[PDB]
Amino acid sequence: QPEYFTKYENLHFHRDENGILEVRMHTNGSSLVFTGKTHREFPDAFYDISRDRDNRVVILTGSGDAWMAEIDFPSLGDVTNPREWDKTYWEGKKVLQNLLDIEVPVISAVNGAALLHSEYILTTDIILASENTVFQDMPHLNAGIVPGDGVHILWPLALGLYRGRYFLFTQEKLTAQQAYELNVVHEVLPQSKLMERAWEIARTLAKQPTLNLRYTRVALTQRLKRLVNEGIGYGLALEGITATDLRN
Amino acid sequence: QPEYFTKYENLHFHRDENGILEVRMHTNGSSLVFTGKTHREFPDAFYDISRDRDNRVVILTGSGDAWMAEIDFPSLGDVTNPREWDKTYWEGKKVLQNLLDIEVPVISAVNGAALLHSEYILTTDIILASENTVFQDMPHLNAGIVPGDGVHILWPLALGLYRGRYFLFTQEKLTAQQAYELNVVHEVLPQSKLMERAWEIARTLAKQPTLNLRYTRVALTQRLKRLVNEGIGYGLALEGITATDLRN
Amino acid sequence: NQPEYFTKYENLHFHRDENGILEVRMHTNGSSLVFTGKTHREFPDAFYDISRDRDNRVVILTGSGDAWMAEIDFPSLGDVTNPREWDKTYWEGKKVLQNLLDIEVPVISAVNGAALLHSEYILTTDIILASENTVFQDMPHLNAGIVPGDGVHILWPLALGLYRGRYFLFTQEKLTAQQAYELNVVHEVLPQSKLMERAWEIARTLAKQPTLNLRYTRVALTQRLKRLVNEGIGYGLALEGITATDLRN
Amino acid sequence: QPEYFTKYENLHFHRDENGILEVRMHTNGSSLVFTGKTHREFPDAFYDISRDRDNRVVILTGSGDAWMAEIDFPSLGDVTNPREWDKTYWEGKKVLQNLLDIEVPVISAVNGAALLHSEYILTTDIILASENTVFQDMPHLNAGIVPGDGVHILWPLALGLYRGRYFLFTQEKLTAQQAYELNVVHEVLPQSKLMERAWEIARTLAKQPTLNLRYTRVALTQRLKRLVNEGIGYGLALEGITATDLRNT
Amino acid sequence: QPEYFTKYENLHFHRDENGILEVRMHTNGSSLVFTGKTHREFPDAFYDISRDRDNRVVILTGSGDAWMAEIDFPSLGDVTNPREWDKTYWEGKKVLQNLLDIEVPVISAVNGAALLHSEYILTTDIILASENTVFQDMPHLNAGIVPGDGVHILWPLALGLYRGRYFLFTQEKLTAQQAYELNVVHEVLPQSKLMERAWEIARTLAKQPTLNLRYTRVALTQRLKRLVNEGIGYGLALEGITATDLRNN
Amino acid sequence: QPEYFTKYENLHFHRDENGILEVRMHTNGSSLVFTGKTHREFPDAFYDISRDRDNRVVILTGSGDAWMAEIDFPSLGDVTNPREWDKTYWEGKKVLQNLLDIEVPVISAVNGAALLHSEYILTTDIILASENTVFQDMPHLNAGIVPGDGVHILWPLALGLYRGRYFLFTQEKLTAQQAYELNVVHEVLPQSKLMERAWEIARTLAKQPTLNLRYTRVALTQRLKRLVNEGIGYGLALEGITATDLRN
């Protein structure tokens, strides 16, 4: 297996003979605790995934009963210092750019609560969720800083520019069933069946010729990439200013 | 209180100690009758609201049991003369530019029928409607002129580019419940409870730091502003030509 | 008393009333359309001809029999694996959507049954009515192993959003008429026997508008749509062409 | 030879064995007098050129000592009537769309004064001008109507958004030499040598593979097409309102 | 005289019977010293100009021997506090939006050094400069903050995306003659002849019908407005972060 | 020094105490011969430069008397096979994205002929050229494939959409003085003075605060990045089809 499969302490990699790669986020085998380390390393991981032509379909998932519900806030660095925030800003632009530049279909298997960094899910092509899943933008309006890391672009795409703004301004929580009705989640599965269904869909896709998988992903992500590129830097800059203001 | 609070005969202003500003449209205390005067003055009122940093959350509403269901068509001026339409054209560009440029969250409390100028509602972040509310683009195809004052952009944004065109071309009426299922309306309230709920949401928002309220509004309106800019002048110029054509 | 182009296209029947309402019906020898290289080449010219004729005041686009478009003659498209032949399909694929969008009056789709290919045509139109037997799918691309790059890649994610739209295309999902109605793609669901009369009823109400209002309302309501199609159509069809070449491998 | 070679009373066509097509605008073999007829027909001619895959390089030129310096104003129809202007508007959008959608390199051989419709030249890839050539947007501000037919987009694209606005607002005239210094004209030739040089450049281009000629044209016009599409309708609608306003005062 | 003509202590207004309005920036009769006050008031002045339909052509100029060469930096407020910078940010978006939304042709008469806020000039249609004029983006790299107030968009639009970046990054100074060769300045005049020439060009323009003046300005600013919209907020936010960072220099 | 300084056999790196990084392209110490290897590795090198916050100003240059005048065309692989061209396509997208995402000012010191890959230069902020320099798009029309690797966007951006198309379609050569008059080259220097002047400009820049350097680069590249994104993939796909056609 490629060297990058063991380069990331918070990502487990497993790939089959069909080139189906499962990337699973974890903290010591448990549900991911998001950290400054993952904020820095995940952009490199997604770049590494995107470079490797042997990846023909990607499944992105978490561990345990949450997709991402925990954060080690201090580990992010002093966000109120613009010279530190700049690292977050640069990494925040790269993570979405590098995710979107994965050049094959990407299946999200959302294995439970997704209360931060749900923008990752909203780069993917097929979204499956376990019945216990809840979606929220929790951290931004908790901290008093702009939801400017891509949720501001992708949630109003997903829900429209009316419900999307309501969702973000009120920190609305959506159940898996609500997100399914809203066309964000495409299938709701029992916890015990989610991963098998992800792999089933992946095996069906993997029967396609490789260039077809790659160029269908390209065709279907052009508009998405343009919309992310329009707003991501500005959102993260605004967010930085609001983080600085926490010292006032 | 600022001078502009008493500058507009068709707008009542009330602001609390948290910077929550309720702007209520009225004609001598009744539901608004839209006029050439409001078409001319509203862009200035929205500019004034946007300039005043003491406004931290804005609630925009009407009076009585309709949000806007009446128009004084002669008071608009001779729309069939391009020299008079040009006033309407310039003001139609400015009203939406200035309304979008309010730099804090805007809550619509839609207190009944919104049969004209519903595009104002479609600039706002949180949309609440009383159970008696109905939405329609009434006047344009009644008059034989283009629905080109922003409804052509914002209704297809709200409903998508399929149902939105059907809605405009057939002058479809949507109930509050239909609009809620279409994600345009976020909460449906009894008439007697609507304003209380608007203020409840506003007070929660107002606990955010001021720069976060402002910059979250900025981040969440970038794409919306671009889309309105793209089409508003062209729509109003085409509408003017069809107004001239009423002479033929 | 009728334009020459009304009888120029062996796969399109034309009928226009005194109000300028033109019904354009796709067919193969009076049956449901079998899409061919011929229709791929000719339909862009037909749509241009429709758009040029100012006597068209509202257009109804429909199929024949119990399917809107559910059949294709693959060989008749030409040797798609040769880029010199695909380039014909490419140029015609750009023109067909540009020309269809540039029809300058409201267009009503009366979807009279299965739409399993070329549903992007429907997704240029303003009012979408479907008979209750209608199903929507992007059938042929992932069956052949080539990119869904002829406009479905732009318009289905526009219609369903960029999440369900991608699921729909990558899994070749089938949507029923009720599903599409709940998804805001179909605006009315009708029994088969009532579909065309409803299309004509809506058209007659529209045709009471002044002519410039019909034209300029269509223009105002299609600006953003035209920009979105122009952004992605050539790129999708070029990528599709490369996957067609790759079929030789 | 294709039928369309003899379809246009104001365009002479000839094509060599290399697929190099020269399209020459004329009025009875003399310099073109622009008319309502050319405004209506030129969009169809440019479409016809673009459809024909045997065209591998195009040279667009005029006749005699002017590229286009005359117009028959009455023949344009009653521009002050929005129902008549709408024809000009629709044709004004189509002519640039269809000209840009010629899918091979286009060489302008500007054979003298270009005082109206110079936007056609600003769709082309290689611009050659005779020493006698002058460029101007003459007619719009002489008539009191908006320069909204594409010159408002393409002249500021050619001269930048500063000199381009100065040029339009003041009806500036540029000699061939000035236009060369401004990078609009690429070579200035003696009158008697212009056409030979156009053909020389065309023959060098024609040695390229056909798909390379077509796809290089596509790659090099994507941005240009987006910019034209952004402003052409709006410009023409504003121009129409100013034409209506000529009935006022 | 409208009330707004005497509302702004740093702008003198004079309008003739043809609706030609000259707006002259000054500080108590001398060349303008830019302040927090002008930063806050100028967006309202430009809005007021744009609202008043009696303005048919506008001439924007400075006083004395400089267009704008001085700034009272302390009067800008504590730029290092994001709560204070936010006023500058909001006003910095409004000033260019409101200036571009003047709906008639705008002539710049650049009467000498333009070392700050030259982006105002780069919204205008016709740029005239006295022989003594120099252009520079002086203050941003002298302070150590981003040139994010519109110069980052408009200088690369004027000079192109290569020379425009060199000009900003190296704080290049351009003479009037250099700017003329670069197509930014359209006419270079002796100091004593500058204003007469601005008025001559304005009187010629004022002979046009009013709607033509307005809609030609609209047609010629659509792309310009989109480009400024794209980048102005982001530039000013970035500039704000670097202003906060001045505490750490 | 960072590990990446010695990771690229065709790039020499030197960085001073002010964070001025000189990146010099070479083949065994001589002028660069462009290869499939550099096509693959340069995107990673430019990513590595962009990630390293100790880089405060970058100077990009070549070796010897040419910036890039030679290409090992066969080392690019079988460009006529779409499965091999896809590597070139993916890498062609990444190299410009990654070069543009260098987040500090980039000075080109063009040390001679730039007959291929001159689009790299057209991402940079300050362009200095030795007097022997000539610019041309040599390889595309020599091979009969589309100039679709970014030159199709950036040369018309530099020279305008008229001269730019002339330049590409006729394989025009521009000398350093011609490029200077066309505003592409900003200073023309004798060969022996070129690098000293690059470093002089760099040292003046490096006195700025770091965030100002970074965010001035960001502000000045937003439009440029959007224009590259618009057309880079389409150009490389069209180029690929023309490469396949070389078999016909």
Short mmCIF file of all heavy atoms in Angstrom, two decimals, chain D residues 141 161-171, chain E residues 57-60 105-110 120-129 183-187 189 197-198 201-202 204-205 217 220:
data_model
loop_
_atom_site.label_atom_id
_atom_site.label_comp_id
_atom_site.label_asym_id
_atom_site.label_seq_id
_atom_site.Cartn_x
_atom_site.Cartn_y
_atom_site.Cartn_z
N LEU D 141 -23.76 57.85 -31.50
CA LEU D 141 -23.87 59.18 -30.93
C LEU D 141 -24.29 60.21 -32.00
O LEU D 141 -24.81 61.25 -31.62
CB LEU D 141 -22.60 59.57 -30.16
CG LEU D 141 -22.68 59.25 -28.65
CD1 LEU D 141 -22.98 57.76 -28.31
CD2 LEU D 141 -21.45 59.73 -27.93
N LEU D 161 -10.58 49.51 -20.40
CA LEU D 161 -11.81 50.12 -19.92
C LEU D 161 -11.65 51.60 -19.67
O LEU D 161 -12.57 52.21 -19.09
CB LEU D 161 -12.36 49.37 -18.67
CG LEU D 161 -13.54 48.43 -19.03
CD1 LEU D 161 -13.87 47.41 -17.92
CD2 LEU D 161 -14.83 49.28 -19.35
N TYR D 162 -10.52 52.16 -20.05
CA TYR D 162 -10.31 53.61 -19.93
C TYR D 162 -10.30 54.23 -21.32
O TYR D 162 -11.28 54.93 -21.70
CB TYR D 162 -9.06 53.91 -19.06
CG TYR D 162 -9.34 53.21 -17.74
CD1 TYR D 162 -8.90 51.89 -17.48
CD2 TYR D 162 -10.24 53.79 -16.84
CE1 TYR D 162 -9.30 51.22 -16.31
CE2 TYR D 162 -10.64 53.13 -15.68
CZ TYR D 162 -10.18 51.84 -15.45
OH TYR D 162 -10.58 51.17 -14.33
N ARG D 163 -9.29 53.90 -22.11
CA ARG D 163 -9.29 54.37 -23.51
C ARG D 163 -10.53 53.90 -24.28
O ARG D 163 -11.04 54.60 -25.16
CB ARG D 163 -7.98 53.94 -24.19
CG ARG D 163 -7.85 54.38 -25.66
CD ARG D 163 -7.76 55.91 -25.81
NE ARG D 163 -7.46 56.27 -27.20
CZ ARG D 163 -6.24 56.26 -27.74
NH1 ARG D 163 -5.19 55.81 -27.08
NH2 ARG D 163 -6.11 56.64 -29.01
N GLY D 164 -11.03 52.71 -23.97
CA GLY D 164 -12.20 52.22 -24.69
C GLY D 164 -13.43 53.07 -24.44
O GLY D 164 -14.24 53.32 -25.37
N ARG D 165 -13.62 53.54 -23.20
CA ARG D 165 -14.75 54.42 -22.93
C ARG D 165 -14.55 55.81 -23.55
O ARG D 165 -15.50 56.41 -24.03
CB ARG D 165 -15.07 54.51 -21.42
CG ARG D 165 -15.70 53.20 -20.91
CD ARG D 165 -16.13 53.34 -19.45
NE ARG D 165 -14.97 53.33 -18.55
CZ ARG D 165 -14.96 53.73 -17.30
NH1 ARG D 165 -16.04 54.33 -16.75
NH2 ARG D 165 -13.84 53.55 -16.59
N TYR D 166 -13.31 56.30 -23.52
CA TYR D 166 -12.98 57.58 -24.17
C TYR D 166 -13.30 57.48 -25.65
O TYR D 166 -13.93 58.41 -26.24
CB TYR D 166 -11.51 57.89 -23.98
CG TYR D 166 -11.03 59.14 -24.67
CD1 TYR D 166 -11.18 60.41 -24.07
CD2 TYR D 166 -10.41 59.06 -25.91
CE1 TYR D 166 -10.70 61.57 -24.72
CE2 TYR D 166 -9.95 60.21 -26.57
CZ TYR D 166 -10.09 61.43 -25.96
OH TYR D 166 -9.61 62.55 -26.62
N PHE D 167 -12.92 56.37 -26.26
CA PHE D 167 -13.09 56.18 -27.70
C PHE D 167 -14.57 56.21 -28.09
O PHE D 167 -14.97 56.83 -29.08
CB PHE D 167 -12.43 54.82 -28.08
CG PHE D 167 -12.78 54.31 -29.46
CD1 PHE D 167 -11.97 54.63 -30.56
CD2 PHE D 167 -13.83 53.43 -29.65
CE1 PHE D 167 -12.28 54.13 -31.84
CE2 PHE D 167 -14.13 52.90 -30.90
CZ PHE D 167 -13.36 53.25 -32.00
N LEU D 168 -15.40 55.54 -27.30
CA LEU D 168 -16.82 55.50 -27.60
C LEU D 168 -17.48 56.83 -27.28
O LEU D 168 -18.27 57.33 -28.08
CB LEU D 168 -17.52 54.37 -26.84
CG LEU D 168 -17.08 52.97 -27.25
CD1 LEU D 168 -17.74 51.97 -26.32
CD2 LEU D 168 -17.43 52.68 -28.72
N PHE D 169 -17.22 57.40 -26.10
CA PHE D 169 -17.94 58.62 -25.72
C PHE D 169 -17.60 59.81 -26.59
O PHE D 169 -18.46 60.68 -26.74
CB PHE D 169 -17.70 58.99 -24.26
CG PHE D 169 -18.70 58.43 -23.29
CD1 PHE D 169 -18.26 57.58 -22.29
CD2 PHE D 169 -20.05 58.77 -23.35
CE1 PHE D 169 -19.15 57.08 -21.35
CE2 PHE D 169 -20.97 58.25 -22.43
CZ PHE D 169 -20.51 57.40 -21.41
N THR D 170 -16.38 59.86 -27.12
CA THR D 170 -15.95 61.02 -27.92
C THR D 170 -15.94 60.71 -29.42
O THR D 170 -15.52 61.55 -30.24
CB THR D 170 -14.56 61.55 -27.48
OG1 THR D 170 -13.55 60.61 -27.84
CG2 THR D 170 -14.51 61.87 -26.00
N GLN D 171 -16.43 59.53 -29.82
CA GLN D 171 -16.42 59.11 -31.24
C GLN D 171 -15.05 59.30 -31.86
O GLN D 171 -14.89 59.76 -33.00
CB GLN D 171 -17.51 59.85 -32.04
CG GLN D 171 -18.89 59.59 -31.53
CD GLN D 171 -19.92 60.42 -32.26
OE1 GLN D 171 -20.09 61.60 -31.97
NE2 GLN D 171 -20.62 59.81 -33.22
N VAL E 57 -23.83 65.57 -17.04
CA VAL E 57 -22.44 65.16 -17.18
C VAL E 57 -21.77 65.58 -15.89
O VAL E 57 -22.10 66.63 -15.32
CB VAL E 57 -21.72 65.87 -18.36
CG1 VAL E 57 -20.30 65.40 -18.53
CG2 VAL E 57 -22.51 65.70 -19.68
N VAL E 58 -20.83 64.78 -15.40
CA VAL E 58 -20.10 65.18 -14.19
C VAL E 58 -18.62 65.31 -14.47
O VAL E 58 -18.06 64.49 -15.21
CB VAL E 58 -20.33 64.15 -13.06
CG1 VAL E 58 -19.47 64.45 -11.83
CG2 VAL E 58 -21.81 64.12 -12.67
N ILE E 59 -18.00 66.38 -13.96
CA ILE E 59 -16.55 66.55 -13.96
C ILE E 59 -16.06 66.48 -12.53
O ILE E 59 -16.51 67.25 -11.70
CB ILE E 59 -16.14 67.92 -14.56
CG1 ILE E 59 -16.65 68.04 -16.00
CG2 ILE E 59 -14.62 68.08 -14.49
CD1 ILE E 59 -16.65 69.50 -16.55
N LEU E 60 -15.15 65.55 -12.24
CA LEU E 60 -14.60 65.40 -10.88
C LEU E 60 -13.15 65.86 -10.93
O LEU E 60 -12.38 65.42 -11.77
CB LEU E 60 -14.68 63.92 -10.42
CG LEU E 60 -14.12 63.64 -9.02
CD1 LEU E 60 -14.85 64.39 -7.86
CD2 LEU E 60 -14.06 62.11 -8.77
N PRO E 105 -22.11 60.23 -17.90
CA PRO E 105 -20.65 60.18 -18.09
C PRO E 105 -19.94 61.03 -17.09
O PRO E 105 -20.40 62.15 -16.73
CB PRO E 105 -20.44 60.75 -19.50
CG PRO E 105 -21.84 60.66 -20.15
CD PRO E 105 -22.85 60.68 -19.10
N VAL E 106 -18.81 60.51 -16.61
CA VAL E 106 -17.97 61.22 -15.65
C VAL E 106 -16.59 61.46 -16.26
O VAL E 106 -15.90 60.52 -16.70
CB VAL E 106 -17.84 60.46 -14.30
CG1 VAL E 106 -17.09 61.31 -13.24
CG2 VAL E 106 -19.19 60.08 -13.74
N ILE E 107 -16.19 62.73 -16.23
CA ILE E 107 -14.87 63.15 -16.71
C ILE E 107 -13.99 63.43 -15.50
O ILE E 107 -14.41 64.19 -14.63
CB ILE E 107 -15.01 64.48 -17.56
CG1 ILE E 107 -15.90 64.21 -18.77
CG2 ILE E 107 -13.62 65.04 -17.92
CD1 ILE E 107 -16.45 65.50 -19.42
N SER E 108 -12.81 62.81 -15.45
CA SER E 108 -11.80 63.21 -14.46
C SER E 108 -10.91 64.29 -15.03
O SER E 108 -10.38 64.14 -16.14
CB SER E 108 -10.89 62.04 -14.06
OG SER E 108 -11.57 61.17 -13.18
N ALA E 109 -10.74 65.37 -14.26
CA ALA E 109 -9.76 66.40 -14.60
C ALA E 109 -8.71 66.32 -13.50
O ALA E 109 -8.91 66.83 -12.41
CB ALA E 109 -10.39 67.81 -14.69
N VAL E 110 -7.63 65.60 -13.78
CA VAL E 110 -6.64 65.31 -12.77
C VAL E 110 -5.66 66.48 -12.79
O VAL E 110 -4.89 66.61 -13.76
CB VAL E 110 -5.94 63.95 -13.01
CG1 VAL E 110 -5.08 63.57 -11.81
CG2 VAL E 110 -6.99 62.85 -13.28
N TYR E 120 -10.71 56.37 -7.47
CA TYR E 120 -11.87 57.17 -7.87
C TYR E 120 -11.77 57.50 -9.38
O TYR E 120 -12.79 57.44 -10.12
CB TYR E 120 -11.94 58.50 -7.14
CG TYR E 120 -12.16 58.50 -5.65
CD1 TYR E 120 -12.16 59.71 -4.98
CD2 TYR E 120 -12.41 57.34 -4.91
CE1 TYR E 120 -12.37 59.79 -3.62
CE2 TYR E 120 -12.60 57.38 -3.54
CZ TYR E 120 -12.60 58.62 -2.89
OH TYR E 120 -12.80 58.72 -1.50
N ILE E 121 -10.56 57.89 -9.80
CA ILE E 121 -10.34 58.28 -11.20
C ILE E 121 -10.66 57.11 -12.12
O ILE E 121 -11.24 57.27 -13.21
CB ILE E 121 -8.89 58.76 -11.39
CG1 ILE E 121 -8.62 60.05 -10.57
CG2 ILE E 121 -8.60 59.04 -12.83
CD1 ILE E 121 -7.14 60.29 -10.34
N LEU E 122 -10.33 55.90 -11.65
CA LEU E 122 -10.49 54.70 -12.47
C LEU E 122 -11.92 54.15 -12.48
O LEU E 122 -12.16 53.04 -12.97
CB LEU E 122 -9.49 53.64 -12.03
CG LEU E 122 -8.02 54.07 -12.11
CD1 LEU E 122 -7.10 52.96 -11.56
CD2 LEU E 122 -7.59 54.48 -13.53
N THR E 123 -12.87 54.93 -11.98
CA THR E 123 -14.30 54.67 -12.23
C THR E 123 -14.82 55.54 -13.36
O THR E 123 -15.95 55.33 -13.81
CB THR E 123 -15.19 54.94 -10.99
OG1 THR E 123 -15.23 56.34 -10.68
CG2 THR E 123 -14.70 54.14 -9.78
N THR E 124 -14.04 56.53 -13.79
CA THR E 124 -14.57 57.56 -14.69
C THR E 124 -14.32 57.22 -16.15
O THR E 124 -13.48 56.37 -16.47
CB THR E 124 -14.06 58.98 -14.30
OG1 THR E 124 -12.69 59.13 -14.63
CG2 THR E 124 -14.28 59.23 -12.81
N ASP E 125 -15.07 57.89 -17.03
CA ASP E 125 -15.14 57.53 -18.44
C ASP E 125 -14.08 58.16 -19.35
O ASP E 125 -13.74 57.59 -20.35
CB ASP E 125 -16.53 57.90 -18.96
CG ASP E 125 -17.62 57.18 -18.20
OD1 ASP E 125 -17.71 55.92 -18.32
OD2 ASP E 125 -18.34 57.83 -17.45
N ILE E 126 -13.69 59.40 -19.01
CA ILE E 126 -12.75 60.20 -19.78
C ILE E 126 -11.80 60.81 -18.78
O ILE E 126 -12.24 61.43 -17.82
CB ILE E 126 -13.53 61.33 -20.51
CG1 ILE E 126 -14.37 60.75 -21.65
CG2 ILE E 126 -12.56 62.40 -21.03
CD1 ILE E 126 -15.55 61.64 -22.06
N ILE E 127 -10.51 60.54 -18.98
CA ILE E 127 -9.50 60.94 -17.99
C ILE E 127 -8.54 61.95 -18.67
O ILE E 127 -7.83 61.64 -19.65
CB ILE E 127 -8.74 59.71 -17.44
CG1 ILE E 127 -9.75 58.78 -16.73
CG2 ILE E 127 -7.63 60.19 -16.50
CD1 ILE E 127 -9.16 57.43 -16.30
N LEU E 128 -8.58 63.18 -18.16
CA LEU E 128 -7.70 64.27 -18.63
C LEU E 128 -6.72 64.58 -17.51
O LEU E 128 -7.12 64.54 -16.34
CB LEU E 128 -8.55 65.52 -18.91
CG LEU E 128 -9.78 65.32 -19.80
CD1 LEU E 128 -10.61 66.62 -19.84
CD2 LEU E 128 -9.45 64.82 -21.22
N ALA E 129 -5.46 64.86 -17.84
CA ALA E 129 -4.49 65.17 -16.77
C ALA E 129 -3.64 66.37 -17.15
O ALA E 129 -3.27 66.53 -18.32
CB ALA E 129 -3.60 63.97 -16.45
N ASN E 183 -2.62 54.42 -21.82
CA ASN E 183 -4.06 54.49 -22.11
C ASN E 183 -4.99 54.81 -20.95
O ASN E 183 -6.22 54.77 -21.10
CB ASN E 183 -4.50 53.30 -22.95
CG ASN E 183 -3.82 53.32 -24.31
OD1 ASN E 183 -4.04 54.24 -25.08
ND2 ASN E 183 -2.90 52.37 -24.55
N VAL E 184 -4.39 55.19 -19.82
CA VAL E 184 -5.14 55.58 -18.63
C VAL E 184 -5.56 57.05 -18.75
O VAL E 184 -6.72 57.39 -18.51
CB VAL E 184 -4.27 55.36 -17.36
CG1 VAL E 184 -5.04 55.80 -16.12
CG2 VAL E 184 -3.86 53.89 -17.25
N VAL E 185 -4.60 57.92 -19.09
CA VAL E 185 -4.87 59.31 -19.39
C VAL E 185 -5.12 59.42 -20.89
O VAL E 185 -4.41 58.82 -21.68
CB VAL E 185 -3.70 60.20 -18.95
CG1 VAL E 185 -3.88 61.59 -19.55
CG2 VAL E 185 -3.66 60.27 -17.43
N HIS E 186 -6.16 60.14 -21.25
CA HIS E 186 -6.57 60.27 -22.64
C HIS E 186 -6.12 61.55 -23.32
O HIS E 186 -5.93 61.57 -24.54
CB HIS E 186 -8.06 60.05 -22.73
CG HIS E 186 -8.42 58.78 -22.04
ND1 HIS E 186 -9.38 58.69 -21.06
CD2 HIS E 186 -7.79 57.58 -22.08
CE1 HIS E 186 -9.37 57.46 -20.56
NE2 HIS E 186 -8.39 56.78 -21.14
N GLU E 187 -5.91 62.58 -22.51
CA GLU E 187 -5.34 63.83 -23.03
C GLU E 187 -4.51 64.44 -21.92
O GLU E 187 -4.95 64.46 -20.77
CB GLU E 187 -6.43 64.82 -23.45
CG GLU E 187 -7.46 64.27 -24.47
CD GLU E 187 -8.52 65.27 -24.88
OE1 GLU E 187 -8.35 66.49 -24.55
OE2 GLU E 187 -9.53 64.85 -25.50
N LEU E 189 -2.80 67.97 -20.73
CA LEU E 189 -3.00 69.39 -20.98
C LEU E 189 -2.10 70.24 -20.09
O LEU E 189 -1.79 69.86 -18.97
CB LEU E 189 -4.42 69.79 -20.65
CG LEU E 189 -5.69 69.49 -21.46
CD1 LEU E 189 -5.72 70.25 -22.79
CD2 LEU E 189 -5.99 68.02 -21.64
N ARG E 197 -10.74 72.38 -21.11
CA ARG E 197 -10.90 71.22 -21.99
C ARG E 197 -11.93 70.24 -21.44
O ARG E 197 -12.74 69.71 -22.22
CB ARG E 197 -9.56 70.52 -22.24
CG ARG E 197 -9.67 69.26 -23.14
CD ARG E 197 -10.28 69.57 -24.52
NE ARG E 197 -10.33 68.33 -25.27
CZ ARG E 197 -11.16 68.04 -26.26
NH1 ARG E 197 -12.05 68.94 -26.68
NH2 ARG E 197 -11.10 66.82 -26.81
N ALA E 198 -11.93 70.03 -20.12
CA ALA E 198 -12.97 69.18 -19.51
C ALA E 198 -14.36 69.71 -19.81
O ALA E 198 -15.28 68.96 -20.17
CB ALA E 198 -12.74 69.11 -18.00
N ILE E 201 -15.29 69.13 -23.61
CA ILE E 201 -15.75 67.76 -23.84
C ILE E 201 -17.15 67.56 -23.23
O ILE E 201 -18.04 66.97 -23.85
CB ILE E 201 -14.74 66.75 -23.23
CG1 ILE E 201 -13.42 66.81 -23.99
CG2 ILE E 201 -15.32 65.33 -23.19
CD1 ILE E 201 -12.31 65.96 -23.35
N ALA E 202 -17.37 68.11 -22.03
CA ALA E 202 -18.69 68.00 -21.40
C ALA E 202 -19.80 68.69 -22.19
O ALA E 202 -20.91 68.15 -22.27
CB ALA E 202 -18.66 68.53 -19.98
N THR E 204 -19.94 69.13 -25.40
CA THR E 204 -20.23 68.29 -26.54
C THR E 204 -21.11 67.11 -26.13
O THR E 204 -22.11 66.82 -26.76
CB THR E 204 -18.95 67.81 -27.22
OG1 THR E 204 -18.29 68.99 -27.75
CG2 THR E 204 -19.27 66.84 -28.36
N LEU E 205 -20.74 66.47 -25.03
CA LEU E 205 -21.57 65.37 -24.52
C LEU E 205 -22.98 65.82 -24.17
O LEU E 205 -23.95 65.10 -24.43
CB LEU E 205 -20.90 64.77 -23.26
CG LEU E 205 -19.77 63.77 -23.52
CD1 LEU E 205 -19.12 63.44 -22.18
CD2 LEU E 205 -20.29 62.50 -24.22
N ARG E 217 -23.62 55.46 -20.24
CA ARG E 217 -22.90 55.22 -18.98
C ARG E 217 -23.24 53.84 -18.41
O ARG E 217 -22.34 53.10 -18.02
CB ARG E 217 -23.27 56.31 -17.99
CG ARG E 217 -22.74 56.07 -16.58
CD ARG E 217 -21.24 56.29 -16.35
NE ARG E 217 -20.96 56.16 -14.92
CZ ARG E 217 -19.76 56.17 -14.37
NH1 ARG E 217 -18.66 56.35 -15.11
NH2 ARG E 217 -19.67 55.99 -13.04
N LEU E 220 -21.64 51.02 -20.46
CA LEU E 220 -20.18 51.05 -20.43
C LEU E 220 -19.59 50.79 -19.07
O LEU E 220 -18.36 50.71 -18.93
CB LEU E 220 -19.66 52.40 -20.99
CG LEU E 220 -19.71 52.45 -22.51
CD1 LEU E 220 -19.31 53.85 -23.01
CD2 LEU E 220 -18.81 51.37 -23.10
#
